[PDB]
Design a protein around this ligand. Sequence first.
Ligand SMILES: OC[C@H]1O[C@@H](O[C@H]2[C@H](O)[C@@H](O)[C@H](O)O[C@@H]2CO)[C@H](O)[C@@H](O)[C@@H]1O
Ligand SMILES: OC[C@H]1O[C@@H](O[C@H]2[C@H](O)[C@@H](O)[C@H](O)O[C@@H]2CO)[C@H](O)[C@@H](O)[C@@H]1O
Ligand code: BGC
Ligand code: BGC
Ligand code: CA
Lengths: 739, 742
Amino acid sequence: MKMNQFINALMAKMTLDEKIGQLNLPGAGDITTGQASSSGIAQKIKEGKVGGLFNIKSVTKIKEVQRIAVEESRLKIPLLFGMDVIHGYETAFPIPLGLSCTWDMELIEKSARIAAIEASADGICWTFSPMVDISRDPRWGRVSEGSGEDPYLGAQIAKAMVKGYQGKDFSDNTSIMACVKHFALYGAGEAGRDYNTVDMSRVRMYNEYFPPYKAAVDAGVGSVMTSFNEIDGIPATGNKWLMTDVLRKRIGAFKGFVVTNYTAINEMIDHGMGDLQTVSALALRAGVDMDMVGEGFLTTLKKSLQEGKITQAQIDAACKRILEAKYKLGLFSDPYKYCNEERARTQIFTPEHRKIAREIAAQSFVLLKNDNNVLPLKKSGTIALVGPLADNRVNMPGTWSVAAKHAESVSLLEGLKKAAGNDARILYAHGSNLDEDKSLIERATMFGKTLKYDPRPKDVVIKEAVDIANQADVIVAALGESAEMSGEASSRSNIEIPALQRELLQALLKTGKPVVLVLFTGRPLALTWEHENVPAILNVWFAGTEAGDAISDALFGVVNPSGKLSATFPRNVGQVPIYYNHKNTGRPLPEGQWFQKFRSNYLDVPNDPLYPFGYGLSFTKFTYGDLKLSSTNLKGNQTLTASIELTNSGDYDGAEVVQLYIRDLVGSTTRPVKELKGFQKVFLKKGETKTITFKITPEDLKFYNYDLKYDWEPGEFVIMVGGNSRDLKSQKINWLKDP
Amino acid sequence: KMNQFINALMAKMTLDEKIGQLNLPGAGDITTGQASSSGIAQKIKEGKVGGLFNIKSVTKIKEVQRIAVEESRLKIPLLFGMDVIHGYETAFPIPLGLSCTWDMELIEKSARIAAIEASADGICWTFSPMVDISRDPRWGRVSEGSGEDPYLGAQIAKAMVKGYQGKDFSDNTSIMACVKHFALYGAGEAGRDYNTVDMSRVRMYNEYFPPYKAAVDAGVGSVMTSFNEIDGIPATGNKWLMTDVLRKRIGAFKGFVVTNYTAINEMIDHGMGDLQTVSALALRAGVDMDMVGEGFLTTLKKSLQEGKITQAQIDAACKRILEAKYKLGLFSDPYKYCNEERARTQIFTPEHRKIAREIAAQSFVLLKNDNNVLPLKKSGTIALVGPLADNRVNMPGTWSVAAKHAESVSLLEGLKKAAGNDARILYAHGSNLDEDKSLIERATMFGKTLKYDPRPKDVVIKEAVDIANQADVIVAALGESAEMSGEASSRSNIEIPALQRELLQALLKTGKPVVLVLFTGRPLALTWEHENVPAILNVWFAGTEAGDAISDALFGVVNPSGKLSATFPRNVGQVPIYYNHKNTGRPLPEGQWFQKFRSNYLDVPNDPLYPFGYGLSFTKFTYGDLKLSSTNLKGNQTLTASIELTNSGDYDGAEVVQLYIRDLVGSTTRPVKELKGFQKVFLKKGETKTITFKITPEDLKFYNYDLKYDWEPGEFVIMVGGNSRDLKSQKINWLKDPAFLY
Ligand SMILES: OC[C@H]1O[C@@H](O[C@H]2[C@H](O)[C@@H](O)[C@H](O)O[C@@H]2CO)[C@H](O)[C@@H](O)[C@@H]1O
Ligand SMILES: OC[C@H]1O[C@@H](O[C@H]2[C@H](O)[C@@H](O)[C@H](O)O[C@@H]2CO)[C@H](O)[C@@H](O)[C@@H]1O
Ligand SMILES: OC[C@H]1O[C@@H](O)[C@H](O)[C@@H](O)[C@@H]1O
Ligand SMILES: OC[C@H]1O[C@@H](O)[C@H](O)[C@@H](O)[C@@H]1O
Ligand SMILES: [Ca+2]
């Protein structure tokens, strides 16, 4: 009895309403433990009207709910239990944007593995993750959930995430089904405003935005979630071209199912697509399989079928897909597969898990500036820790951490005191609130992620910090955003550090003491003034439940920072969108020659971002020899070997991310000045040299041309290697086809 | 006839002579007195020059044309072109400013006068109008266009072509127009000039193309390509664009295509290949004339010998250039536009300046007028303060290459004239343009300098404050310099320069009522100014008559009647923000900012500061309820929509009544509203008039997902008011007629 036979047999037993019921993923409402079977959701499950549920927590609650299905519904079809497990379950790793800066695919996969272990131990068998939306717009709150602006890096991370979640077998009780989102183009919302209109050409979609989604699918992701945005004037959720012709294009078949985003079907009414029945039929016809919360499928599909607006086959295909996911997950052989109390008791938020998170977090930090050897700090003397983010636990996990043990996180103050012990004195001061305008603080600290609010006049509180700082040999400024300043529906028209904090920072600098800016953020910020005036800048994103410890490992040099930016840091928001893989234009500005009239440039700011893609410093220094190519004249399907000597020429052991970029000089369409095509993170002891090697083939040269044909064209290419997208060793080559 | 004449001419022509017609080189300096031995002379004699541009003075142009007529083998005369953008010697407001008149008659007149002056000076071809839609205030070239709306843009494009070209090309008072820049130029990424452009086909057709199309339908003689790529192919080499779109219908276009300045050569930089390759690409795409770069002149013959182009491609391009010259009357009289007497009497005349002054005053947009600050009483004392208070050469704005910049009327000048003996005007610099001198320098190129005060800003501010304290009202002339906009004048910051904001603050702090007369070439972020300044008059850049026109507004000689053609954002973080937007699936209900999980920001409302079509008056206008002839229509019927407008204020005035239509449901998402009509009407104080609009299914059509141009049966909302924001509305139902389905 293989899957297809079993599933066909089952569906032959089902009524029309039961098939439709499988397509329903409703909101659950409150469920009183001890009386699940008589709760609001119970009746629906009993009537076969529920295919799955989500964001229900605890194996105890889940088992009982699952028992209603197994024992009290006619066919005893078990439910899927999903959740947003985004960057950890109870143990929280850094936010995804932070994790992507590790450029370490092993660590990425590992964090996903541990998340799956924890979530599955607590009854969850399906996560709405990874989010792989490409974005070039820092205003958008959701950049925190993604992996930056690059399709290659993004695609690599997609594979790592899906593999971590899903393992080699869906039926394993430590593996959960992943869900790539949000298909598609969500990250191009106009003016960085969440949910706003998206528009772009087909050729831009294929080269610049689609690749990460495709990587997830090729990796075997089990499901796909639709996006809130329209494309070509049709909401993704109702977009047949996208959901059928692209997603399920013959060769490269996606086998899983498509679930809508939260009431995305109903929102098509607001989009302007028609009434609930109309937009529901549109969604099903497009290839949508499961309806999240809005119940458009449940309440309208029969009427449409009776009216011949949809077919039985359409309903059947969607039903079968849901049932197949359940079968693959092991639910028809054991509906309680993911419900073991002892696993939940022993495998969640363990000391070992927290240790791994701590180690992973330290490798996500990006050191953006370190003048005059300020870092690492000596573990002696006195250290002043100042800022609205110095001593707060609940913000450390950042946004999208619904299952995290927020109140058990390690504050920076806590982590610092511990690491220092009796070797160094740690002094503390609030310094300032998150921002002037209390109402902004409030909407930025939703979901219980509150900060201590100081009712005293800002000058009073600053004077307090300055006077404390004057007693220290070095100041550590913990500034930046709060957790919920990014995330969903957290768009900012201003991407600077809040004025109040900058005013505070100014006061700290004026003490004359060395200041280290420890920066908390869920997005790229505009930091020109900070870069000019602060000796050392460490971007720690949001590091998770172990933030305080991981950050202290960095500060004292237990761990040498090795992160690299996966997204461009602009000089101001007026530069947006600014990104490394751009076209040359017909009037490029020669490097270093800002400003030039009649070139492509601004009157009031240079063209360069502040920090480019791939940027990141170390406590040590890395020296690149000259790029060596095995050939500069290639023919057909040959392999080019590119190699380079890398030397740790600094004072500390450390790792660096070696990056490979390729520029296609001439094409039938304009080609980007460069695109990432490989990378390698390597650790080097002080004074050690290693040969780093990349192997290139024509596959690395391919792109989607004007007719959307994926292929490469003969001609000249530039091969580049270095420690960021700007500082590169390069060499030109000629690559020819052959008859 | 023309066809027989040109065919015969072309039969006499050598390959090189045909190629030469396609050349539009830079001229280099031509010493008046020895044009026939100048640098450009030899090339003309050899038949290598199809035309020239930016040569000025009928005297010079006459002697250059003589070279072609008397000293070339076939005597084929030249076109003479120029950027006549908003007036020749008499400067009208910058285009964006002109757009705010919402007066198509006035607009056509300004073009008419501009053609009269240019043609009188030997010019027979203008690189105008630029009709690029833009939703990005950062782009300095918004100043050259007409805002963010396709319908208003299309109406203006039509009015401009009509004004220039008149009834017949061969009139010595008509010149050939050139709609630019085809296409999509105004969507350059991050508002940085020349930067990458990218969008969907369906957005192109509904949102960006219409103005270009109206130019063509109005009979524009030529089209200029743009610098941006499209779908990864530079416009100048984009065959789909230049041939499939531009020349889709039978005899739709029929004119010729010229490249932008070295746009072919720049395709090399784009990454499309070498000069020959990109030249051949351009010719195949449908480009006919090569501006400055000489890629056509130097490479076409080789490409032809190599089979990369065809003879017929060269012949077709050459043919179009000759037809242009034929239509313009050049083969009948190569000197037609070369009359010394016309040039002496018909240019920068008192009459022309008067008209410019009239038009300018109609282009101003009154953004705020609290507590009846405006209009000013012509009595007591008035303090004029700001870096734009007393400067002539900036008044004409950018793209005013033929303007009499130095003869422009400064604001101090106009005000003192108007005040006469009735009020005393007091002046003070207040501050420089910006705290950054190198920014000032680069923002005041092309000779448009501002006098620089080397004293400490605080000393100068105090100087102005002490003057202000002597006045009963203060007039602050602040904003941009002329060349802070225009080409390659992109700004990442769209506020009034910080130094000036600081000055402004010190003025308000005097307790005196302050009027902000704002000089700008772009929308600016003005939330703070709107919050603190009693009155705000946006004067754009009004031309050579700026001071007189502005003074007309200030004292109430002319009741301001302009309305924004582009949205004013609260900050650059909202960009792009525009009125004709999609609803999204999570729209923020009106008045409800902030709402979590709706489409909105944490730190700023969704609303711009001032919406499309916004404009105040010295008086007030009351709208009655919207009357519709029917709520249930079928097939090709006419809906009549009427409304009572009443002047309920204290002054005579005009207001622009705007018609918007919303298509509620569609096979694709439809914008929450679209401008579909307008009428500007003058009303005596207390007068009431019935404004009427005729609506048909044509007004309902759009380009669907498959790019089919059609309307769909269903509900629509008809809206009327003096704002894209404040409207009377009514829903209707419109069905197809089964009988007439074809
Ligand atoms: O001046 C208008 C016209 O100038 C064009 O050429 C520039 C050129 O780019 C620059 O190198 C030189 O120093 O100045 C000349 C003339 O100003 C420019 O390329 C055009 O876009 C511009 O419209
Ligand atoms: O909670 C996450 C989820 O909430 C969704 O519904 C919101 C709803 O918009 C709001 O009115 C209510 O107060 O909170 C609920 C749920 O907390 C929201 O629409 C989703 O996008 C969001 O992911
Ligand atoms: O929680 C389920 C879904 O809720 C939606 O509102 C979010 O946009 C998704 O990212 C999330 O997976
Ligand atoms: O001078 C002719 C052309 O020069 C170009 O550089 C400008 O961008 C065009 O708008 C202008 O018409
Ligand atoms: Ca190539």
